[PDB]
RNA sequence: ACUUAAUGUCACGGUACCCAAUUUUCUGCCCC
RNA sequence: GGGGCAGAAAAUUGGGU
């Protein structure tokens, strides 16, 4: 009686190849995939795939010896005996199982029992000579065929305990069970006594090969050329540092549609770059990049556009790389004893962006691009793998049972622990979500504790998940009661009302990658002792879980006997305080900028640098909502508290974080160890409250010598929006083990008060004013343990030629201090704070002495002025959220070259290769910008920074707090403006006229009341000259106050002296902010209101004092009269404000000209004047020009 | 047949896990 | 008599089990 018995795998299952019992000694994949599937080869490609007979008969078996004990070993009234399963030649595998028995005349080859002839113990066959076996199991074929195929090798794990690292891994050929997994075999059956109980253990077994089962009876070639082709196109171009950022922006285009290449929606330049952007506007084999990529696109429209984006980011990312003991256990269940079978349906939503790890491809081929790859799937979709959601669950289990092992491979015992004995009776099915977009990618870096900037060949990018997925969950528990222990981790797992989920599933969980929210909990149980008639019918329900999570199986009544989240002992007192959750919103008034500067290149609007925003999935909507959510990156968040604690405690800056047992290794995690501190996404929750949620902010550096702006250097972010008066509430949280002592917590409540207090600004630009921190506000739900622990300078400025003249004066001189420089190689570290050197805040007043320009450049069309006058760039004031702001980039913009002149630095913003030869080299050798700090640092150099070392002094945006707004002009179109002049770029050639003139010093701009002949001839210049030259602005008026904060860190005694100094020169003494310095614009007055030093301690005016004293003292080695140092008195003069009577000062204009004698072409001939223009234009702050 | 051996397959018997701040420097500025 | 730059230099994987 043949019978055809047909497989079907409805999860993922495993195949090794076959060897054979002699050779599967010598491999330990063999030995180890005993009981998978199995693959023979028919050269070593493209073979056949089959389960063995044995393993067939092994479930079989084990599923008769399950039900009999089930029934009292008799199955439909017919008794049967214990069975045999001991040896005197052995069986090839040996049980080294605990096997179930009953409590049941002598068996012989006559009337043996239904059970003895299912093992076949009297058949004619025994240990192979034909068909000759009472009951035979054929081997179960599947039904070319290359193995990358049928299955994708996967590398498993085995986490430890006690720390969270891995202690070994071993890996496995997870097969598709989407379409090769039906295997088809035959089993033949001489005694019809037992063929209803092999039926019964046919529709009884539950999973072979790693994988629940049901029995029932009866291209790359032309895409790598064309890379490889655009990669030489941009060695023509010597661009090949963004090839490997053009890779990335590949990458991503996988997120955007088709119509993102094929209706171009890249960023096109700026309207009158006429070079398009730097880019995308590449010409590659004479053509432009989009429409190489469009061309692309057309040409490889089979393979999808994610494969297509896929294969030609890796591609350019490979072109660009390249180039770059036998005992038996008779186990009796007692007498009337009830055994069920549970089911645990739901939902695995990611509360948290998650992240399965898995090997990189061409490593995981049986038989590329990200650092980090997550685990797809072959239609990919995200996959919640078995292995990793149940070795999550032995973990929790054991931490909810507080005594487990660390388990043991290849052990002849079973493990009798607690976690392990229930281990056994839950199987879990493996999950995919029906989501198959690509997974975002998230950067990594990791800062130099000594340079505060980023490391060497420390930047890497990670696969991540959307967060919101809902991954189908099921858990099947076969035992006689339902463990308590299991109901605290699915109530652990389960997202209550204030319990949020705590299922950390997957890795990276120390930057709070894969926290899922289990829900939508249905308990389903089988009466299996006296309900098995139907338990066979349906399979268990096996393979169609979600027609139980939507919804009448027979003999399947819900279990509504399991416990509440707070009824459970080893929940409240085990899993409950395991980790501790600290949720608080951090309030920051500045602009926030992340800077996902991979994504600015792809999505329209073309600014250099944009802010990082998630992408979230919604559940109920299906799909990825619409808006994505801006926020701090949780490892962002995680590395802010770890540099924290480390400058604290003094862990940071050691040589090597060995296996180390210090405060910030204990609680971060090491080499060897696990994080106690697991951080999660800074969300903004404050986005629907603003009217421009991201603000677009123009800098530029301004070259030292010309005053304007370099050949190279303008730069548009585009961070979020935020101010004093509308901040930016981000609420993020972080968990904390029950590890913590009470220094231990008292260190993290200390280096969260730091960000409180704002030591440690947030994104990029920290400097310039970005992401500084207001305050923290502490959630009410976080434990009481933590929430509770919760100046005028006298100095005064003579002036030599302006008083004497009741004159025309240039409007700008140069500083020719020397090519004396002097290098602090000892460089001084952004490591724990140093006692000696000094650290604190400072509160600045800033008085306008002349109207202030300070432009809104993020739109040229703010005064509304374009229409009447076509080109017209017409600016509105700075303002962020509405209210008038300076940024700090142009507050530590003047006083970097203040201090830098104040200091004789070395012009760190120069103009090189720029013909006059080239400017760089006619500066001698010291004044040039400073390399790597192995030849030393600036003194303004190693204040404010340079590259890769960050400044230890932090500027921020000035605030107003009251004053005279506007200037009236009463005229003007808005009424509040002034058309400025024609701006006309800085000429080197007037101060460099030959070969002989060097070079002059660094360009100031003198301090002159000019800006009321633009007011007054307001009528005379809309007229005379073309409104697409002319700039039009609002102007802040006369005495206008604002207040700007200098996050000072690790300064020396004399640097923040010299910076003191630097801040308020003293009287009659000011500086010079935005446009309009030549015409006389911008004059600002800084007053230092109170400085703080925390070692949060206010230092008084007497201790204002010998800071700048002293660092009058360095200023001589390299109160105090400053105008003593020649290059200070001429620094000074420059500075000297001549109204605290009025002299004239303006440029010459050419030949009669539109005039107002002193002109150029005979000002700036070298008959009617000789050489020494750069003898009265520099190293003479306030020479008379008109009369010279 | 490729491929099972049979009175004994806890491999669902093993989280690809751990360490890392997309940051550092830059006045939206200006005359032959 | 004339608009000029509108990003540049870097790091874009290194260690464990
Ligand atoms: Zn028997
Ligand atoms: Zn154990
Ligand atoms: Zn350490
Ligand atoms: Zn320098």
């Given amino acids: 009686m043949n019978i055809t018995v047909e497989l079907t795998f409805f999860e993922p299952y495993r195949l090794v190849e076959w060897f054979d019992w002699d050779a599967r000694k010598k491999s330990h994949s063999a030995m180890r995939g005993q009981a998978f599937a199995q693959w023979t080869w028919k050269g070593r490609t493209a073979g056949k795939s089959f389960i063995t007979g044995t393993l067939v008969r092994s479930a079989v078996i084990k599923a008769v010896e399950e039900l009999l004990s089930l029934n009292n070993g008799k199955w439909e009234g017919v008794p049967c005996c214990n069975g045999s399963f001991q040896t005197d030649k052995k069986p090839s595998f040996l049980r080294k199982r605990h096997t179930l028995q009953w409590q049941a005349n002598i068996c012989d080859k006559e009337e043996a029992c239904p059970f003895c002839i299912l093992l076949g113990r009297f058949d004619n066959a025994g240990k192979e000579r034909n068909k000759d076996y009472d009951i035979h199991f054929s081997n179960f074929d599947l039904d070319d065929l290359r193995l990358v195929d049928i299955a994708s090798g996967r590398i498993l794990n085995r986490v430890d305990f006690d720390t969270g690292k891995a202690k070994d891994y071993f890996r496995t050929w997870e097969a598709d069970y989407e379409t090769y997994g039906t295997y088809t075999g035959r089993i033949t059956l001489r005694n019809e006594h037992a063929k209803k109980l092999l039926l019964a253990s046919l529709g009884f077994v539950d999973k072979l090969c790693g994988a629940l089962c049901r029995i029932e009876v009866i291209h790359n070639d032309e895409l790598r050329k064309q890379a490889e082709v655009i990669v030489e196109a941009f060695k023509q171009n010597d661009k090949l540092e963004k090839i490997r950022i053009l890779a990335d922006a590949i990458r991503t285009l996988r997120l955007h549609g088709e119509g993102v290449i094929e209706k171009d929606e890249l960023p096109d330049g700026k309207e009158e770059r006429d070079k398009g952007h730097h880019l995308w506007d590449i010409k590659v084999q004479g053509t432009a990049l989009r429409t190489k990529l469009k061309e692309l696109w057309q040409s490889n429209k089979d393979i999808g556009w994610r494969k297509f984006t896929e294969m030609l980011g890796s591609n350019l990312y490979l072109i660009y790389k390249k180039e770059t003991s036998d005992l038996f256990i008779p186990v009796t269940p007692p007498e009337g004893i009830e055994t069920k079978e549970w089911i645990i349906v739901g939902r695995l939503k990611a509360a948290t962006p998650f992240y399965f790890g898995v090997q990189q491809p061409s490593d995981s081929i049986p038989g590329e691009h990200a650092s980090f790859n997550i685990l797809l799937d072959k239609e990919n979709r995200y996959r919640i793998p078995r292995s990793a959601l149940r070795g999550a669950l032995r973990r929790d289990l054991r931490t909810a049972f507080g005594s487990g092992c660390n388990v043991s491979l290849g052990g002849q015992i079973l493990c009798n622990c607690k976690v392990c004995i229930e281990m056994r009776r839950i199987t879990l099915k493996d999950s995919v979500s029906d989501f198959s977009e690509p997974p975002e990618i998230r950067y990594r870096i990791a800062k130099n504790p000594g340079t505060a900037t980023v490391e060497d060949g420390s930047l890497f990018d990670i696969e991540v998940g959307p967060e919101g997925l809902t991954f189908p969950f099921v858990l099947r528990y076969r035992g006689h009661k339902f463990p308590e222990q299991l109901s605290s981790v699915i109530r652990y797992w389960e997202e209550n009302d204030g319990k949020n989920g705590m299922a950390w599933l997957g890795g990276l969980d120390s930057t709070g990658k894969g926290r899922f929210a289990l829900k939508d909990i249905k308990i389903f149980e089988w009466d299996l002792n006296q309900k098995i008639n139907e338990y066979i019918k349906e399979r268990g329900m096996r393979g169609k879980e979600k027609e139980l999570l939507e919804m009448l199986p027979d003999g399947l009544i819900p279990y509504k006997f399991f416990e509440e989240r707070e009824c459970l002992f080893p929940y409240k007192e085990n899993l409950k305080p395991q980790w501790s959750e600290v949720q608080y919103t951090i309030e920051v008034g500045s602009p926030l900028l992340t800077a996902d500067t991979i994504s600015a290149l792809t999505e329209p609007g073309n600014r250099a640098a944009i802010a990082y925003k998630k992408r979230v999935y919604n559940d109920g909507n299906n799909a990825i909502e619409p808006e994505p959510r801006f926020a701090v990156k949780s490892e962002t968040h995680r590395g802010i508290f770890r540099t924290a604690v480390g400058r604290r405690t003094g862990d940071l800056g050691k040589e090597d974080h060995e296996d180390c047992t210090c405060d910030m290794c204990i609680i971060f995690g090491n080499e060897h160890e696990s994080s106690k501190i697991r951080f999660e996404d800074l969300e903004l929750i404050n986005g629907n409250e603003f009217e421009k949620l991201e603000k677009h902010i123009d800098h530029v550096a301004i070259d030292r010598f010309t005053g304007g702006a370099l050949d190279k250097a303008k730069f548009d972010t585009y961070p979020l929006a935020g101010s004093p008066k509308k901040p930016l509430k981000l609420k993020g949280r972080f968990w904390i083990k029950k590890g913590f002592s ?402 004239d000062v303006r440029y010459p204009v050419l030949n009669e000209e539109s005039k107002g004698d002193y002109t150029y072409k005979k000002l700036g001939d070298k008959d009617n004047l000789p050489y020494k223009t750069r003898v009265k234009g520099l190293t003479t702050p306030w020479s008379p020009w008109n009369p010279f």
């Fill in 742 to 1143: 009470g220094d231990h917590k008292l260190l993290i409540t200390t280096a969260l008060s730091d960000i409180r207090d704002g030591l440690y600004p947030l994104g990029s630009k920290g400097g310039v004013g970005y992401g500084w921190v207001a305050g923290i506000s502490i959630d009410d739900n976080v434990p009481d343990d933590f929430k509770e622990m919760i100046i005028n300078n006298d100095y005064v400025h003579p002036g030599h030629q302006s008083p004497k003249q009741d004159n025309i004066y240039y409007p700008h001189y140069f500083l020719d201090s020397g090519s004396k420089v002097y290098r602090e190689k000892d460089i001084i570290t952004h490591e724990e704070f140093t006692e000696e050197l000094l650290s604190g805040k400072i509160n600045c007043k800033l008085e306008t002495l002349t109207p202030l320009i300070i432009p809104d450049t993020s739109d040229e069309n703010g005064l509304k002025l374009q229409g009447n006058k076509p080109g017209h760039k017409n600016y509105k004031f700075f303002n962020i959220n509405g209210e008038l702001m300076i940024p700090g980039s142009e507050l530590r913009g003047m006083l970097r070259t203040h201090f830098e002149a104040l200091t004789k630095s070395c012009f760190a913003i120069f103009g090189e290769d720029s013909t006059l030869k080239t400017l760089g080299g006619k500066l001698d050798k010291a004044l040039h910008p400073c390399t790597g700090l192995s030849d030393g640092l600036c003194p303004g150099c190693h204040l404010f920074g340079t590259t890769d070392y960050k400044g230890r002094v932090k500027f921020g945006f000035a605030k107003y707090e009251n004053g005279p707004e506007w200037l009236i002009t009463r005229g003007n179109n808005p009424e509040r403006s002034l058309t400025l002049g024609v701006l006309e770029s800085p000429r080197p050639a007037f101060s460099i006229p030959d070969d002989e003139s060097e070079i002059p010093g660094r360009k100031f701009y003198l301090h002159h009341n000019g800006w009321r002949i633009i007011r007054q001839k307001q009528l005379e210049i809309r007229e005379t000259v073309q409104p697409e030259r002319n700039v039009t602005t609002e102007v802040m008026d006369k005495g206008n106050v604002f207040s700007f904060d200098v996050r000072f860190e690790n300064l020396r005694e004399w640097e923040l002296g010299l910076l003191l100094q630097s801040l308020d020169p003293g009287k009659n003494i000011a500086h010079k902010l935005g446009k309009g310095k030549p015409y006389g614009f911008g004059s600002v007055k800084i007053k230092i209101d109170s400085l703080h030093t925390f070692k949060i301690k206010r230092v008084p005016q007497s201790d204002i004092r010998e800071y700048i004293n002293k660092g009058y003292q360095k200023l001589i080695e390299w109160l105090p009269q400053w105008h003593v140092i020649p290059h200070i008195d001429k620094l000074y003069k420059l500075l000297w404000v001549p109204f605290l009577l009025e002299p």
